[PDB]
């Protein structure tokens with residue numbers, strides 16, 4: 175038992191991180207087979223990136239993989255990611271996919287500087303398409319990812335920080351999450367909401383782990399629940415969310431809508447000096463899958 | 476910016492995990508050079524382990540490293556760890572040390588089942604020598620560790636769960652942290668305390684990240700602070716702790732004892748509907764080193 179904010183093992187991704195240097199800019203790149211993916215704002219001189227990139231030569235891109243300098247033999251831009259063709263395929267290339275995740279989905283971030291991993295932590299895509307990361311200068315190109323059995327599904331690459339201290343980036347095909355653009359003009363996150371289905375998942379994690387104090391006898395209708403959710407800036411719970419919460423409901427014997435009744439009282443009364451799973455806040459960065467994964471011990475080969 | 480519960484990159488450790496099977500027991504082992512370390516309670520039949528181990532043959536130990544079965548050519552017991560001599564040195568053996576950490580120190584846990592990594596998370600050694608882990612059956616032998624530049628310092632190997640849902644284990648030389656013994660007789664954690672110096676470190680993390688609302692004009696004496704700390708079940712702050720908090724004090728311009736004044740008011744008034752670094756509780760599982768590492772971007776080769 176116990177319940178932790180758990181990241182995926184990072185080794186498969188560590189084996190792909192490289193340093194990409196162009197001009198006075200150093201950031202991280204992702205080396206899969208013979209391509210290095212990195213944010214396009216690595217390039218030189220309201221930017222027009224097509225113009226900027228046409229002015230570049232391959233030898234402008236210094237790619238360091240450990241103590242090995244990688245030779246760029248071509249380059250292309252796909253949306254906001256640059257793809258550097260290199261003459262060597264990464265022998266550590268895992269089995270991988272590129273996936274564009276939905277808000278509310280979680281992932282592990284391997285924070286990197288100069289191609290070297292610094293730390294790993296779990297993140298959710300917020301409803302406003304930011305992530306509350308931990309990122310300093312030089313962390314651009316760090317990726318977020320999930321693992322399924324043996325496949326690394328990359329879903330995030332870091333581009334920029336917004337004035338509230340949250341972070342914005344793209345999928346690995348270079349499409350920003352949210353309305354953000356890779357130019358240093360004024361942009362702001364947008365008002366966020368709490369990921370309701372994930373809070374319910376974490377309440378089920380709590381029950382699985384022996385916390386039951388927040389339960390009640392009541393029930394609620396989905397309609398009636400969503401009316402309370404909106405008042406507290408929670409995402410509407412859909413029937414799909416209810417269905418996704420099925421396995422957790424079945425394992426605990428607590429109907430989804432009964433858990434919704436508990437959450438409603440938690441929203442209306444607070445927790446009154448008590449904690450759930452070591453938290454004094456309602457936690458929303460565990461998906462139903464995360465809960466089931468951690469509470470049943472799924473591993474990855 | 477941003478501040479996350481960040482674990483070390485786990486890949487160097489993932490490359491060492493193996494499955495150890497003996498009788499009807501399967502758990503994890505740590506393969507470094509030609510030795511596999513695992514909890515001694517893996518062996519068969521108030522146990523007397525010397526008697527139990529003398530009755531064993533090498534071929535009773537099934538060691539799986541991926542799809543490769545490792546041959547045990549010898550075995551010995553050191554405290555509560557078993558060491559299985561195998562005929563193959565792990566080629567992925569990182570540079571490593573074994574270290575016995577002090578309560579309050581943090582580490583990353585690579586949770587494993589059947590030799591396969593499941594997840595990574597950050598943990599502290601509690602003052603009562605438990606850890607609040609996330610561990611199911613089969614996770615024994617998962618290790619906790621820190622990384623310094625390129626060296627993996629192993630400090631924890633998982634043995635058992637206690638009735639409160641917390642966890643007890645040993646250093647990699649098999650010495651339990653705390654008074655615990657590896658027998659299924661009644662044992663209990665002991666009353667825990669909050670790791671004061673770490674709370675102060677995390678308040679400095681908060682300031683570094685733009686949270687200043689909890690600061691005040693006041694100061695306090697170490698004596699006067701510790702008198703309030705004890706009332707709230709906090710560890711005494713020592714002058715060594717104050718000195719360790721020097722770099723963070725110097726970077727933020729907030730004298731340690733001034734931060735102690737802030738913590739005292741936080742203890743006395745609560746936070747009153749406000750959060751610090753996304754938490755509604757005073758967080759104590761970041762060491763001063765953790766804060767400086769994350770807020771300045773130290774990486775690991």
Ligand SMILES: *[C@H](O)[C@H](C[C@@H]1CCNC1=O)NC(=O)[C@H](CC1CCCCC1)NC(=O)[C@@H](NC(=O)OCc1ccccc1)[C@@H](C)OC(C)(C)C
Pocket residue numbers: 201215309310311312313314315333334335336337341355356357358359360361362476
């Ligand atoms: C790449 O390593 C860094 C990572 C940043 C650095 C600090 N934390 C991070 O996550 N990325 C940047 O430094 C990028 C670089 C530009 C990205 C767009 C194309 C040109 C290069 N810049 C930012 O992340 C800045 N954010 C920003 O400009 O946002 C739009 C904006 C502009 C003006 C007002 C409001 C919003 C950051 C560094 O600037 C602030 C932290 C001041 C917001």
Ligand SMILES: *[C@H](O)[C@H](C[C@@H]1CCNC1=O)NC(=O)[C@H](CC1CCCCC1)NC(=O)[C@@H](NC(=O)OCc1ccccc1)[C@@H](C)OC(C)(C)C
Pocket residue numbers: 175502516610611612613614615616634635636637638642656657658659660661662663
């Ligand atoms: C190894 O993979 C598991 C990991 C456990 C399983 C659940 N969570 C974990 O972290 N370890 C065990 O299952 C060990 C095995 C014994 C360890 C001592 C030597 C003999 C094998 N057992 C426990 O971890 C149990 N704890 C325990 O017995 O503690 C002492 C005790 C005994 C009686 C009353 C109170 C305390 C766990 C599995 O039992 C409880 C969860 C019921 C405490």
